[PDB]
């Protein structure tokens, strides 16, 4: 019966001396092993979907698991150096540098030592009057643009090489500039405000283009070099193209869109929603994919991010004084790690090093998360 | 039949129940008269250049109005007016919306007891503007007291001559939850539940919008139409 | 401080916004005096034995009231009164709820302008019952006109003697969306949006509860307290 | 490498002459086959979780699938015999009989022929004045109890053997009796109404017990012989025990519970919810399990049922004039089969025959669903 | 533009200036509505079969109305109700004139008859609905909110609200018949209250004393 | 008993039934009080020297007033006031008519309920003027509401000291056809028949006075 | 000029400043018109034969009224009405006092604004009674609102025919201390000082009349 | 039970019955509240430094008030404001009596002073808040809704609403000083409006003519 069937299958597979073994469908033994490997990958919890998917080069003696030793779960450094709050924090494009923007007057650069993956203050920048609320790094990490709260009528452009303030910009006193986005060309940026200003500006401080009629909250310049995604007030994200003056609709929601981020593949959008949690939208099909369950977020600006290898994990902050991490196939959270006292608003993930994470709190801590000891 | 688009341009600081019950009443009356077919209503908050007393910035009010009209199936929150640098008169915004609707429904201004009474305030309205508004687009007013509106129409002459375009709508289920009382109750620390939609209320307490400092923000400054005229 | 539980026993046919704004106002006033601490409110619809005119069966009203108070965190819809075979006087239900609360907060009756004015209608209230209610439990009334309540308290003698237990609460943000007008508007076919919670409204048109046949269902029948007394 | 590892595993498994085969962990080849079989079962769509789960007696030459030939998808008979509406329809406990309750005066018994699985009218019962809205069969299918709409003050008990009306029951004219439930002893029944009556009655027409204070909508007598589950007005399902006068709370919801059914194992509760769809609750843990997505149901009484082998499929009606079927592991519907004109309210499944289904409509059809041709 | 005929059915004991002002106001409003055209107005005094109090014989009132309307150009007085020996109803009279008269007839009244609709159990609701639906109503009042208030409360009137027109009057003119009779009883002069010919007639015949 | 002559002033733009009814009510009250015998009434339209208030030329109003009173018997129209090159205070008119009559019945002024109010506004009337008017001739006030006139008399000191020479007559018929309302009705082309004497209506229609 | 004697009736349970102020206002008005000379005022409390309305015995009220008017000069308390075994209509009281005075000044009744209203309710007053009262003696009505009294006179035919014998006096001080309100204040133990003469307050406190 | 002293700061030209009725009503209400005890009431006429119109020399008013309050058992008249040669403020006077007087002082007024709080830019908001918070207010008004209306509109008053008591008066007594002066000017008798001793004093000295 089953034993004879298994013996027959093994004898067929060994044909690739079975002539004496016979006395004593297409290739079928292999596909059973492939299905077992597929189930093994499915049951894996902290999986990684690159070089491990769409492959048939896995061992068979021991069941497949992925290591969670390289996974941020243990706090290491509490960079208590600011005074009032740490509103924002973001890693550079190269992974070497971190920039944390506080509440009073400071954006601080922390350099990591690749020998030991530990951070140290490098240089400090002052002069901001109403605080720092958004930071955008240049594509080559040579300049950073820093913008303050909703009533900041000017923005400061810096020079990370030295710390000197290059030409600041201010079109008018009655203005608001909250969001910024760099261009892939690395020589222009698009700034936008809540009042209605939606500009297109040169590095030296000139103005190249502008629009009217749209109250933009968050911007993002696509890889095509021409399209800019903007968040509206009617709970939409729309694509705007200059030199064509054209606009198109790709996302519509039922609540304010507080913040959004776009993956490096330019395919998915991860966005926070007020009175709900975190949503994921596919722009090609304009279809909602996931609705991750559980974040205490009312009408408050809370940023989230992608992370892991091949953009596999989704990290976010909340008002529970905790930090949430998700795997991109599950409703429920993976690890509700705690440690903060006040609220957490600008959690971030290292782009290059896959095991460094930053959590900026409301009490002035920039707690750094890495592998467990 | 003819198609009617109602347009309401006021303050909406903050939006309350009457600002929607007005639309419901107007739709009821116009569909019951057997001569009209209401298909849309528009809310257009006024910009910050109006320089009124204790007016919060525009985007707060726009987001409030958007939250209020989330379930309604025929009400929009268009905001072309609020973004203009300079103050826009009522005739200009009416013309803008009407000519946008073409490039066909007729747009009709939605009013109350206060504006028909404000027509008589000196140096607040140009007579050419008044006759244009009353005899080119229309005017609908819903009032607690019908005879006050009829008397006010009777005393003047342009309103009487163009009186076939002014429809007075009576209402018997009383509601006078005005904005000033809402703000006063909110400043003290009372509860404004069941007078505003819940989302607006939660958004109000979250941001702490209304207080004495926001209240005493425009004292003695001449109102925008008066200064221009 | 002392703990007070508000109890409202009326008709609720159907429930509207004022029946909840009353609770909000009462809680505000009691907590603002620095001598009380409101912890609960109870809605108790009256049974079908009341034999009022145009009263729909009890379970419809109970389900309506349950739908209305879905989001409130301190209001319950207890329904012991409605299930009794015979009509129960106000003193009996007050006593039942008070003695259930023990086997400690004190229960206080929530009232309006109509009931205080109904105290004067002959053969509608037993004097011993009136003095018991006013001098053993309490009485809270919210009114459009404060002087009317004060005058009515002044004219009598038992109310004056026990006047330290009667708290008159004034309200300045007007709402008079009474039940009769709601039913009249619903019969014609108008819209009652933004006067009732949405679930109640949807339930009402789903079941088609209110019509002329239901409205004219108890004509000439003596009201239950009058017949018993 | 992999080839040598596979050869080594096969050689080890064949040890249960490999001595010459060697020249030319515990048992590991078997568990790979078991995992492949588990994945095969997982990928199966119209699965059956009995005698196929917790077993290791499946063939390995051809991939596992379950038949669809035995699955209700094609209408066969349209029993257009009533006049106004068909409010209810239910199969007997033995599977031989069907009882359909109309709107005007009739409950009709249809007998199935086991040779051809086809239905024919057997006997008719008249006398009901306000219509029939609920039917309950005796445990041995010897009597059925029929109750009308919300203002029916009397209930009719019949005799399926002959059709003679045994003692009808009416305690008082000012009464309402809508729901009924038999006892496992087969000699008593619990009836209940919207007004507040909640009785415990003998077969001959006497009254044994009653309660007060509860407006029951739907009842269900458990297998323990003492406990009765009742649906309240405060959106709850509570357990009541007589001879102890005790009550306990096991289910709480946020909307009216329009109807509910309990599985033969007495473990799960399948219940409709107004302004949402169909929910499944585990009574032991008092935990919601599934929230099946998509049924057009407002404030209207719509009945659903379990079905399939080992209570595997979940069938329900809706106001879309369609009928929905679900597999008990998925959010989305399996087959949104259509055919009706007016609304569908009392869909039912045959208890014994696993391929017979009844759909009662609002236009007077009792459409019978069976295997596709 | 439809052709409409106005009908007044009152006691007219006696006739004063306010009734003719009512006719003028109703015609002005109806022509200014933009969809109507008034062609004829009829005054029909109530007969003496009513057996009321203070009601003089019908021939005197008919002669008074004939004197009053002599100078008008479009108002006429009909003398059929006075000659009937049995008290007929309003609906019967409206039907009779409609058949005798194509233009449609309409009824002239005030705020008194609209209120008198709503007294407890006096008129038959079928009679009210035939009067309102088949013929119509023009309700010229000195107060505007009260007529709409009465229409709102009454279900039949609200159901047939399209056939009722209320005309606001903004000139105070309250020359009721009772006040005129009281003034005449004591010898007070009523000149310029009543037309000259009919005042001279009353002074000559000593109708009230 | 004593004789008395009633004199009324104003603009009369145009004339309405209200003014004629005012003479009739004043005459009835004076004859009924049992101490006087009214013998004459005089109407004095204002001339073309007053500040314009939409006022048509004097001769139009004068002939209108004559057409109104043609049927009456004891009412006359005096054109002396209209034929003057300078505006005259009403005290001068009272004095002139009294002097003409002497060349002797007392002249009593006729006024509405608004003159009593105007007596109190500051810097409009001289104290000696009001003293002369109320002490030498007197007033008759015909009002729709009598309580307000009594209140106006009560506050003013001169009127209280001379309260015996002021009479108040109640009007129990509610008709106040104000000249402004009828002018507005004329402007819109409406019909004012039965509110103004027939001859005056015919004349107004013929000449097309207001437009 | 002619003489006149003012007579007032009622119950006076108790007596307040309102009644004395009514006497003073009537005297001032009557002397101010320059046709009369008031010489006396009489108060006549009702006796213990009327239907009970919470009325204390007659002698209590009589001595209270005497205590009130002890300081006054031209006001007297007549106890003939109280010392009778049968209730008397006010016409008989008027006749008796007029006969006593003759054994000659005219007697004028004093009444408030409520007697005019009571004159009109059906089946309470005989036509001949009102005719005699208004034609032979006359009334003086002291009212807070004068328009309503004039309206009440205007409708009633007998009063209009005899309107020359009815006088109306306006009260410009708003104080109406009704006996019912002050009785209620006494019942609850509150203080009524400065609303009633001091001697009467002391007497009421001493005997504890109302409780 | 706290000890409270009532203070009246008015012109008192002249004194009439309503002021003493006010004192009686305020004492009755305060004792019947259940938490208070009145021990003394003070009347302090305004001095002659005001330089107003119709204000007679202060010594005459002081003598009048002394005559009026002679028979009372718990009311006294204070004569400090009259003797001051410079016009002092209300808050200064309240402070002076509080230091001279432990019982707390409170102010007696009507509906006129509560309204006069809200005139545009006359008082200083700090002054109003010290008066209301430190001392208190008793507002014996003939109208009840109006006082609460004024308290509701004013933010300071609503903030300090616990130190303001409004007492309803249900007996019409409107004997204002202006009406008394007008009556005295023309020789009208004012007996039973004003206490007997002070009326005799005024008649003897011919204060108003
Ligand atoms: Zn893995
Ligand atoms: Zn399967």
Author numbering:
A (entry chain A), D (entry chain B): 122 to 137, 143 to 150, 281 to 629
B (entry chain 4), C (entry chain 3): 6 to 108, 148 to 273
E (entry chain 6), H (entry chain 1): 6 to 106, 148 to 255
F (entry chain 5), G (entry chain 2): 6 to 108, 148 to 255
What did the study's authors say about this model?
Here, we discover that human WDR26 binds the metabolic enzyme NMNAT1 and mediates its CTLH E3-dependent ubiquitylation independently of canonical GID/CTLH E3-family substrate receptors. Cryo-EM structures of NMNAT1- and YPEL5-bound WDR26-CTLH E3 assemblies reveal an internal basic degron motif of NMNAT1 essential for targeting by WDR26-CTLH E3, and degron mimicry by YPEL5’s N-terminus antagonizing substrate targeting. Cryo-EM structures reveal that WDR26 acts as a non-interchangeable substrate receptor for NMNAT1. Within the supramolecular WDR26-CTLH E3 assembly, the WD40-repeat β-propeller domains from two WDR26 dimers are exposed and provide multiple binding surfaces for NMNAT1.
All visualized NMNAT1-bound WDR26-CTLH E3 assemblies form giant hollow oval structures centrally encapsulating the hexameric NMNAT1 substrate, overall resembling the yeast Chelator-GIDSR4 E3 encapsulating its tetrameric Fbp1 substrate. However, unlike in the Chelator-GIDSR4 E3 where dual substrate receptor Gid4 subunits bind N-terminal degrons of tetrameric Fbp1, the data suggested that the centrally facing β-propeller domains of the WDR26 dimers mediate NMNAT1 recruitment, thereby positioning multiple solvent-exposed NMNAT1 lysines in proximity to CTLH E3 catalytic domains. A 3.8-Å-resolution map obtained by focused refinement enabled placing atomic coordinates for the β-propeller domains of the WDR26 dimer on one side of the complex interacting with a pair of globular NMNAT1 core domains from neighboring protomers in the NMNAT1 hexamer. Here, the loops within and between four WDR26 blades establish interactions with three NMNAT1 helices, which are distal to the NMNAT1 active sites. Nicotinamide-mononucleotide (NMN) is bound to NMNAT1 in the focused-refined map. Substituting the WDR26-interacting NMNAT1 core residues with alanines (core>A) only subtly impaired NMNAT1 ubiquitylation and binding to WDR26-CTLH E3, suggesting that other interactions anchor the complex. Notably, a motif we term NMNAT1basic due to its consisting of three basic residues (K126, R127 and K128), anchors WDR26. Thus, the internal basic motif within NMNAT1’s disordered loop is critical for targeting NMNAT1 to the WDR26-CTLH E3.
